[PDB]
Design a protein around this ligand. Structure first.
Ligand SMILES: CC(=O)NC(=O)NCN(CC[C@H](C)[C@H](C)CCN)C[C@H](O)[C@H](O)[C@H](O)COP(=O)(O)OP(=O)(O)OC[C@H]1O[C@@H](n2cnc3c(N)ncnc32)[C@H](O)[C@@H]1O
Ligand SMILES: CC(=O)NC(=O)NCN(CC[C@H](C)[C@H](C)CCN)C[C@H](O)[C@H](O)[C@H](O)COP(=O)(O)OP(=O)(O)OC[C@H]1O[C@@H](n2cnc3c(N)ncnc32)[C@H](O)[C@@H]1O
Ligand SMILES: CCC/C=C/C/C=C/CCCCCCCC(=O)O[C@H](COC(=O)CCCCCCCCCCCCCC)COP(=O)(O)OCCN
Ligand SMILES: CCC/C=C/C/C=C/CCCCCCCC(=O)O[C@H](COC(=O)CCCCCCCCCCCCCC)COP(=O)(O)OCCN
Ligand SMILES: CN1CCC[C@@H]1c1ccc(O)nc1
Ligand SMILES: CN1CCC[C@@H]1c1ccc(O)nc1
Lengths: 425, 425
């Protein structure tokens, strides 16, 4: 038996297992898959032999992400500025200007006023209380309705919606306006900063930091899928698909929220959590790496396309690159290459699509989704509680971070909190 | 004896005398000077023979100024777009960009946050209540201190200060942050709109509208300076520098606030008004028309110069123009041509100064100031009351408008209110 079993070897599990180990606890980490890192996944390109790509979560910003910065510094992990955009190819209508902030002067007054409203609304959110504890239900409505109320002129309207579609991984009618405001709050109450935090990347992929952390974790079992967590006895019993159980005084659930429903908890989890757990969050973000020819470096495109965003990802050769597109898997089928071409050509009619690469997070039984975003009405009902302990079982991860949900920083933050709680007892 | 004596033949007096006349009242208008229009003054250039210039208040915006628009439409008075700026020559430091909104991307987040603060603060102001009636005293502090608290990076810092110096006619340490916020409030709670309302000009000078209104006023006496207003008897007695008194049931004071102290009121005005009346407002705006050679059309300059603003005013010839500079008469002496050259050359080192033209509003006994701006601490003590009747004596004018102080629209608005009040009784 162990002091702690950690379930899941994403960044959160890795942090928690390492820091409990360095505190002198006896820890076991169980990861269901054949790799560590979770929704941070670097691997070989499907399109380009020998090419290392981030298929999951690539970007960071030192200022917004101090725990991640500290990890990078601890292990001397090299980062680089994300590809600068030097060419803008928006689809926002004839008055938009082709630069990173494409709003024309004729919209300036409207943007001013909307800026006040958006930040006013976001300033209602105290990031420590939980979205269900602040009388925020009036904001917890479909984004398209909230945006219709701002009544914005065309360029800024579509610019906001496009970026919200990219960032939330939901179309406007499925996204919560409240969750959009939570992301604003999380970035030091900044609309701009939501996009500005795409600031740096791992020079060698997020695996660099995965490997550094794992090297400090003495006991890790891969291909070990947890199926039951039973705290009915004096010591927690952890049951596993094809093997003998493991026991520990404490268990950390560091798996994705949308998989918790596949674990049997004994006794059953607090009733208020159960239906959100059963339903899952609604995020459907779909990131597609597009292998292309005929694109010059430094392109960014934002617009009204089925791809709200399409931007430079990496050089492959002198004539070839990867672009990245964001959309959502409810609205777009990435295996339909014809559809991919149409979506690309919309912005960039000179560009030839060679290939696509993505991971199906939704179909992956170890995830059942990409990054977190709640369905409308979910998080103003129950939110903070999803990341709070039930007896000796802690719940951690990006999915349940109050402070930086959906980012690596949030995986670190939630782990930090579970670790401290365990150290006190 | 008359139903009403109107004192002062600026726009406010003109409106009030005309509309009381058209209502069937018997009205007399007394103007101390040799001309009508007041602080709206078109005349011949001192520098350029035969050239008609606006030496006072030139600009209007139909959307912000519906009473003025209605006057223009009533009389079919032609307006034109103000000179478009096509060339930007700012002094805001090496990161500023040379366009109308000179803020660089590296300041975007700071501007976002300041935008929220400024509009939050301005949204505390209800334009109908008076600045003294809303618990606003905490904002009624020196602008430089308020701005230091926003802690803005250099370009937006200086851009804000420069425009505030231009618009208020006071240096930052004499201006009230509260009054800056009042101008924001007045423009539909818009910082941008403060500058955007410089939108159109009278094609033939503001005299066009002065003349149209005056033609409807059957009795006007020029060179008739009022010295006393005595409502001790049943009928008001109006006493005059070199002449016999005039009598009326009602008197409208439509003279500038800083001259009211030169009139003897009987009985004395309500005590709360008296000290602001004695002291006068603090506006020192100084508009200088600069005759130049070597400037191309369409220049705007905003910066840290003794002229915060310097911009195109009119074509004189193919090689010559008028520019306009705004500063304040406490900080700058316009008759020092050497100083003018230095101030111009700062922004535009290729430009030769031929001549300057201005009106000394401060020295003019019929004004004792340019447009209104309060001293720090004045208007959170007494404001709305300055424009309220004392018995049968009404007080009107731009100076005391709650809604558009310092603009023609505010002259019209205050007159409208006195007129209605008189018509009811
Ligand atoms: C994007 C960006 O640019 N920047 C970012 O900051 N973030 C990127 N991003 C999203 C990536 C997107 C999908 C998107 C397409 C790409 C974005 N670009 C947000 C952020 O990166 C992630 O949401 C974040 O790093 C989450 O970390 P944690 O919070 O630690 O959970 P997770 O990683 O999921 O590891 C769970 C482990 O449980 C294992 N497991 C499951 N069931 C199990 C069982 N029963 N038994 C045992 N093990 C089990 C399962 O095998 C797995 O190994
Ligand atoms: C600028 C802009 O672009 N746009 C603008 O909208 N506005 C421009 N602007 C300011 C112009 C600036 C100074 C600046 C340099 C230039 C701006 N650019 C604000 C706005 O234009 C003015 O502040 C506004 O139009 C004020 O109208 P009212 O409110 O009607 O007062 P006023 O006109 O002063 O007529 C008082 C009459 O009493 C007579 N009087 C005095 N004492 C007497 C006495 N005892 N007995 C009898 N008469 C007497 C005295 O002879 C005079 O005829
Ligand atoms: C009493 C003090 C007054 C202080 C005034 C400072 C602000 C006055 C700004 C005056 C000029 C604005 C012109 C608009 C730009 C333009 O026409 O030309 C535009 C460029 O304009 C823009 O960048 C639009 C973005 C504006 C964003 C909204 C800003 C909200 C922030 C308020 C700013 C506060 C300033 C300092 C804190 C070119 O695209 P177009 O040629 O295809 O079209
Ligand atoms: C969850 C939904 C997220 C929605 C995100 C929409 C906003 C994301 C914007 C992302 C890009 C910003 C880049 C900055 C520009 C730049 O780098 O390049 C700049 C141009 O940037 C500017 O125009 C600065 C003015 C910004 C004004 C402040 C805006 C406050 C308003 C908030 C806007 C809200 C948007 C829609 C309502 C060039 O000068 P430089 O090359 O010498 O330097
Ligand atoms: C909001 N996030 C967190 C995970 C994926 C993601 C993301 C990353 C880049 C981009 O352009 N948009 C969204
Ligand atoms: C604020 N006002 C009202 C009267 C003068 C004035 C003004 C006009 C133009 C400009 O650039 N700045 C100030």
């Amino acid at each position: 038996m162990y002091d702690a079993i950690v379930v899941g070897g994403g960044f959160s599990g890795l942090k928690a297992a390492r820091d409990l180990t360095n505190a002198g606890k006896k820890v076991l980490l169980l990861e269901g898959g054949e790799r560590l890192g979770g929704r941070a996944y670097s691997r070989e390109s499907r399109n380009v032999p020998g090419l290392r790509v981030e298929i999951g979560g690539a970007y960071l910003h030192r200022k917004h992400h101090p725990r991640l910065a500290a990890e990078l510094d601890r292990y001397g992990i090299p980062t680089a500025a994300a590809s600068e955009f030097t060419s803008f190819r928006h689809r926002l209508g004839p008055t938009a200007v082709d630069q990173a902030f494409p709003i024309p002067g004729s919209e300036a007054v409207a943007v001013e006023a909307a800026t006040y409203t958006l930040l006013r609304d976001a300033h209602r959110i105290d990031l420590e209380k939980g979205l269900e504890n602040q009388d925020l239900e009036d904001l917890d409505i479909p984004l398209n309705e909230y945006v219709d109320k701002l009544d914005l002129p065309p360029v800024s309207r579509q610019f906001l919606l496009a970026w919200a579609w990219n960032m939330l991984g939901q179309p406007a009618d499925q996204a919560s306006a409240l969750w959009m405001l939570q992301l604003v709050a999380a970035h030091h109450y900044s609309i701009l900063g939501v996009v500005l935090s795409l600031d740096e990347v791992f020079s060698n992929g997020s695996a660099d930091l995965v490997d550094a952390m794992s090297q400090e974790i003495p006991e890790i079992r891969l291909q070990t899928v947890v199926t039951g967590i039973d705290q009915s006895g004096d010591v927690v019993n952890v049951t596993v698909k094809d093997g003998h159980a493991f026991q520990a005084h404490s268990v950390i659930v560091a798996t994705p929220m949308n998989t918790w429903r596949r674990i049997v908890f004994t006794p059953a989890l607090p009733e208020r959590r159960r239906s959100v757990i059963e339903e899952g969050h609604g995020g459907q973000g779909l990131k597609i790496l597009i292998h292309v020819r005929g694109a010059e470096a430094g392109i960014e495109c934002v617009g009204d396309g089925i791809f709200p965003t399409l931007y430079d990802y990496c050089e492959v050769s002198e004539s070839e690159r990867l672009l990245v597109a964001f959309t959502d898997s409810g609205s777009f089928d990435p295996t339909d290459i014809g559809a991919v071409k149409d979506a690309v050509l919309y912005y960039l009619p000179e560009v030839e699509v060679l290939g696509i690469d993505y991971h199906d997070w939704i179909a992956d039984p170890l995830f059942e989704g990409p990054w977190v975003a709640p369905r409308v009405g979910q998080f103003s009902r129950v939110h903070k509680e999803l990341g709070e302990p039930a007896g000796r079982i802690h719940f951690v991860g990006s999915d349940v971070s109050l402070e930086f949900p959906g980012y690596i920083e949030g995986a670190l933050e939630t782990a930090e909190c579970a670790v401290n709680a365990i150290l006190h007892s």
